[PDB]
Write a protein that binds this ligand. Structure first.
Ligand SMILES: *[C@@H]1O[C@H](CO)[C@@H](O[C@@H]2O[C@H](CO)[C@@H](O[C@@H]3O[C@H](CO[C@H]4O[C@H](CO)[C@@H](O)[C@H](O)[C@@H]4O)[C@@H](O)[C@H](O[C@H]4O[C@H](CO)[C@@H](O)[C@H](O)[C@@H]4O)[C@@H]3O)[C@H](O)[C@H]2NC(C)=O)[C@H](O)[C@H]1NC(C)=O
Ligand SMILES: *[C@@H]1O[C@H](CO)[C@@H](O[C@@H]2O[C@H](CO)[C@@H](O[C@@H]3O[C@H](CO)[C@@H](O)[C@H](O)[C@@H]3O)[C@H](O)[C@H]2NC(C)=O)[C@H](O)[C@H]1NC(C)=O
Ligand SMILES: *[C@@H]1O[C@H](CO)[C@@H](O[C@@H]2O[C@H](CO)[C@@H](O)[C@H](O)[C@H]2NC(C)=O)[C@H](O)[C@H]1NC(C)=O
Lengths: 53, 433, 433
C-alpha cells in the first residue's frame, strides 16, 4: 500500500474503514561536525530545492 | 470587543486564538471541529426500474377477421395474422383453415417493485458547508452547531460568533450525478428521450406518478408456430438490471480528500480542504480584571527533551519566578509550534507539551503579559507509521535557529574586500595622470 | 434528417426555417413561442411574521418576597419590586404597610394568526426556461412544451426536436429574494441575528413548525405606578407591521424585459431575453417526392406597394406559368423581411404579404427550387403608435439598388485620373533626365 504524508484509508471485508498516516521518517543524522547533512534535507522533499544549493 | 481569525478545516487540529487585549488579563481560546457536512441542492428529472412485459390473453377466431384499437398506452403493439390453425387441449378449434386469424397485443407498464428502488438522475448544484464545533474559553466548555455561509451566526453563553463564508468554493462532486439505494455514481445519463434500448435509461418518468412514460425498448412481436397457442415477442431485456452488475465505480472508493459520502440527504463529510474565516463578538464577562491578575516577574524557559513525532512529543518544563499566583494562560507566538492545554496552574514551575515538525523550533513563549524565548534541537522518532493524523498543522521546515544555517553564515566572503583592493589599485594607477 | 436553426425568443414573432433537402420538394417550418417562463430554483433561510406579548397575570404577596425561577421560553424576562399598595374594587388589599412585593414576567411567542399571513426570505440560484411552442408545418400543426436546456428532446409526429442551450441564463433576480402574500422584493435581509429590532426580520423561525423562534424585540419591564394594579411594559412596535408600509417598490414594477412575476411557485414568464438555438432530427417520411410536386418554370415576380408598418406592410404579387396543378412552399432567402404565410395553391397567380423594416426590400423569393429577384421602393407610414408588437424584427438599415447611395456612386469619381495622368506627364521632362 502506498503511504504518502497525506495518509491512506483502506477498507477490507466488513469492518469499519481504517486509516494510516506517515510521519517524517527519513534517516540521516541531522547534525554533525563533519556534517554530511544535505542528505537529510534531501530526505524531506527530495529532488526538489537541492538544485538551489 | 471584536476579533477575526482563521482556522484550518480538518478534524482533530486544536486551534488557539490569543487575543492581545491590553489593559486586561490576556486570553486564549480553543475551537475544535467535529464535523463538516457538505450538501448540494438536488434537482431531479427522472428515475428508472425494470419494467414488466405485461401481455393479455390473445384474441382468437376463425371464419372471419378483425382489426385493432391502439388506445393511449405505452408502446401499444398489435397485429393480426393470416393462417393460425391450432390444436388445443382436445381436437381443434375451428374448421376454416384458410380463415383462421389470430390477433395479439402487448404493452409496457412499470413493474411492481418500481415503487421500491430506482436511480434518480440528480442535477445537483451549489453545495453549502456545515459544521459542528466546540469552543472553550475561560468558564466555557460548551459546543455549538454552525452554518458557515456568511449569514447564520447566533451565540453561545451570551457571546456572538460568526463563521465564514468559505475561502474556496470547491465541491467534490460533479453536475449530473446519479444515486442508488445508498450510493452515488459520477456518470452521465441519457437525455430523457434518447433512451436507446439496453443501456441505462431505457424507460423513465418525471416522478413516481407521471401517468405517461417514455419507452424505446425495441419491442416487436412475431407469429407463433402451428399447434400451440401462445404469443412470441422479442426485445432487449430490462437494461436496468444489466447496469446493476457493471457499476464498477462508486464514489465512496474514489472521492478525493477522503471526504466520505453519505445519503438521505446526499452529503459529503470531513473534507480536508482549505480554511475558514471566523469573527467573534466577545463579551467582557469572560475576561478578568488585570488588578486580580497573577503578577509574574523574571520569566525564563528551558527544555528537557524533544520528540519530532506526530503526537505531543516535546516536553518543556518552564522556569518562572512568582510574587502572587492565580490562573494564567499560555500561547505560542508563531505558526511553528502548538501547545497542549490553554492554561497552567501557577505554582513555582510548570510543565507544558508542545508539538512541532521541523527539529529546530524557536516558538518564543507567551505567558500572562510576559514574553521570553527558548529554543531546542530535536530528533526524529524511531517509528515509521502511525494511527492518527498530524497535530502540527504548521509543517514549516526551514527555520534559521543558527544551527545548520550558521554554516551559511560562515559563507561570508571577504573576497569583496579583494575586489575593492582591485578597484583601489586601479585608482592609484590613475593618480599618475 | 439533421438540421439546426437559431430562432429568437420573442412571444408571437413568426419565424421561418427553410430546408433544401435532396430528392424532394423543399420544405418550410414555422415556430413561435408563447409561455417562456424562467422558473428558477430556490432555497430557504428563515421566516418572519408579527408577534404577541403573552403577559401572564400579576403576582403579589404580603410582606414576603419571591424570585424569578427560570422558564425556558423565548424572551422570558422577569423582575421583582417592592413598595406597593394595590387598591382593588373593595378598596384596600392587606395589612402590611411598606414590606409588600410585586412579581411579574413577560415572554413573546410567534403569534398564531400569522400561520396564514407570513413573509419568506430566500436565497436563490440559477434558472431554467420552459418554452411552449406551436410547430406549424405541413402535418396538422401540434403544440410542444419543453425545458429549453434540459436537452430533454421531446418528439412529435415522428420527429425529435431538441432545444437550447440558452445563453447566460440572464435573470431579473438578485440573490437575497424576499416574498410576501402575492409579491416579491429584493432586499438585504438580516443574517439570522436581528442586530436591530424594529426592523424587518425582527423575529425569525426556521419553518412554520420549528419549536423555537428567535426574537431580539427589546422588551424590558418597568415599575408599577402608585396605588393601582397593572403590569407596565414598554417595548418597541412590531417591525413586521411597520415594514409592510415601506415596501414601495416591487420587482413587479422594476422588472427588466417585461417579465410578469407570479407566486406559488415564484416564476417569471414571457421575457424577451436573447434567443434560442434549436436542432432537428427530421423524419424522412413527411416530405413529398419531387415527381409529384409541380415544377413551375418561366416566372418573374412583381410588387404592388411597400410600407414600414409593423403588422404586415408590403404586398407583392408574382407571375408564373404552370405545368401541373399542385402546391408549393415559399420562402425568402434573407433576413430583410418575413412572410405572412407558408404555402400556396400554386395555380398561376400568387399574392403574398411581406414586412420590410427601413429602406429597400431586396428579395430572393423561392418557389420549389426556383429563384427570383425582387426589389421595391417604399412609402413610410403616417401613424405614430400602435397597440401590438412588431413583425419585421430583422432590423436592417442599408442597401444598394438604384436609389440609396447612388449619389455616392456618382460621387466617388475624380482624383485618381488627375494624379496618375499628371505624373505620367511629369515624366516627359523627368525621364529624359
Ligand atoms: C388561502 O388559500 C391558500 C392556498 O391554499 C392558503 O395557502 C396555504 O395554506 C396551506 C395550509 O397550510 C399550505 O399547505 C401547507 O404547506 C406546507 C409547507 O409549504 C410547502 O408545501 C407546499 C405544498 O403543500 C408548497 O407549495 C410550498 O412551496 C412548500 O413546499 C406543508 O408542509 C403542509 O403540508 C402539511 O402536511 C405535512 C405532512 O403531514 C405536515 O408535516 C405539514 O406540517 C402540513 O401539515 C401544507 O402543504 C400552503 O402551502 C399555503 N400556500 C401558500 C402559503 O401559498 C392560505 O393559507 C389560505 N388562506 C388562509 C387565511 O388560510
Ligand atoms: C394551425 O394553423 C391554423 C392557421 O391556418 C390555426 O388557426 C386559426 O386558429 C385559431 C385557433 O387556434 C382560430 O381561432 C379563433 O376561432 C374562433 C372561432 O372558433 C374565433 O371566434 C376567434 O376570433 C378566433 O378566430 C382562427 O380562426 C384560425 N384561423 C385564422 C385565420 O386565424 C390553428 O389554430 C393551428 N392549429 C391547429 C391545431 O389547427
Ligand atoms: C466538557 O464537559 C464534558 C462534560 O460536562 C466533558 O465530557 C464528555 O462527557 C460525556 C458524558 O456523557 C462523554 O460521553 C464524553 O466522552 C466526554 N468527552 C471527553 C472528551 O472526555 C468534556 O471532556 C469537557 N471538555 C473538556 C474537558 O475539554
Amino acid at each position: 500500500i502506498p503511504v504518502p504524508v497525506e495518509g491512506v484509508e483502506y477498507r477490507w471485508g466488513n469492518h469499519k474503514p481504517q486509516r494510516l498516516w506517515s510521519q517524517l521518517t527519513t534517516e540521516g543524522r541531522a547534525h554533525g561536525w563533519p556534517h554530511e547533512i544535505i542528505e537529510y534535507y534531501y530526505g524531506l522533499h527530495p529532488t526538489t530545492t537541492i538544485v538551489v544549493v | 470587543y471584536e476579533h477575526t481569525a482563521v482556522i484550518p478545516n480538518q478534524v482533530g487540529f486544536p486551534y488557539k486564538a490569543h487575543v492581545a487585549r491590553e489593559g486586561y488579563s490576556p486570553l486564549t481560546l480553543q475551537m475544535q471541529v467535529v464535523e463538516t457536512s457538505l450538501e448540494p441542492t438536488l434537482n431531479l428529472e427522472y428515475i428508472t426500474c425494470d419494467y414488466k412485459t405485461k401481455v393479455p390473453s390473445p384474441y382468437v377466431k376463425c371464419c372471419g377477421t378483425a382489426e385493432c384499437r391502439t388506445q393511449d398506452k405505452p408502446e401499444y403493439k398489435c397485429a393480426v395474422f393470416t393462417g393460425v390453425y391450432p390444436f388445443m387441449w382436445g381436437g381443434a378449434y375451428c374448421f376454416c383453415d384458410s380463415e383462421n386469424t389470430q390477433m395479439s397485443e402487448a404493452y409496457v407498464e412499470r413493474a411492481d417493485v418500481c415503487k421500491h428502488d430506482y436511480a434518480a438522475a440528480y442535477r445537483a448544484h451549489t453545495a453549502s458547508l456545515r459544521a459542528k464545533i466546540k469552543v472553550t474559553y475561560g468558564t466555557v466548555n460548551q459546543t455549538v452547531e454552525a452554518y458557515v455561509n456568511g449569514d447564520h451566526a447566533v451565540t453561545i453563553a451570551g457571546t456572538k460568533f460568526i463563521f465564514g463564508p468559505v475561502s474556496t468554493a470547491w465541491t467534490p462532486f460533479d453536475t449530473k450525478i446519479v444515486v442508488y439505494k445508498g450510493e452515488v455514481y459520477n456518470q452521465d445519463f441519457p437525455p430523457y428521450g434518447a433512451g436507446q434500448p439496453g443501456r441505462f435509461g431505457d424507460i423513465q418518468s418525471r416522478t413516481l406518478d407521471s401517468k405517461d412514460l417514455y419507452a424505446n425498448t425495441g419491442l416487436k412481436l412475431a407469429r407463433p408456430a402451428a399447434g400451440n397457442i401462445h404469443v412470441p415477442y422479442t426485445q432487449t431485456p430490462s437494461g436496468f438490471k444489466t447496469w446493476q452488475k457493471d457499476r464498477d465505480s462508486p464514489l465512496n472508493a474514489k472521492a478525493p480528500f477522503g471526504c466520505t459520502i453519505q445519503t438521505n440527504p446526499v452529503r459529503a463529510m470531513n473534507c480536508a480542504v482549505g480554511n475558514i474565516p471566523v469573527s467573534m463578538d466577545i463579551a467582557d464577562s469572560a475576561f478578568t480584571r488585570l488588578t486580580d491578575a497573577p503578577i509574574i516577574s523574571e520569566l525564563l524557559c528551558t527544555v528537557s527533551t524533544c520528540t519530532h513525532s506526530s503526537d505531543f512529543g516535546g516536553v518543556a518544563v518552564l522556569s518562572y519566578k512568582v510574587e502572587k499566583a492565580g490562573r494564567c494562560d499560555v500561547h505560542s507566538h508563531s505558526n511553528v509550534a502548538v501547545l497542549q492545554e490553554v492554561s497552567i496552574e501557577a505554582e513555582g514551575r510548570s510543565v507544558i507539551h508542545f508539538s512541532t515538525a521541523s527539529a529546530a523550533p524557536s516558538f518564543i513563549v507567551s505567558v500572562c503579559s510576559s514574553r521570553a524565548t527558548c529554543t531546542a534541537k530535536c530528533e526524529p522518532p524511531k517509528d515509521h507509521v502511525v494511527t492518527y493524523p498530524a497535530n502540527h498543522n504548521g509543517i514549516t521546515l526551514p527555520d534559521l535557529s543558527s544551527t545548520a544555517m550558521t554554516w551559511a553564515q560562515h559563507l561570508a566572503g571577504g573576497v569583496g574586500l579583494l575586489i575593492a583592493l582591485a578597484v583601489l589599485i586601479l585608482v592609484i594607477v590613475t593618480c599618475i595622470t
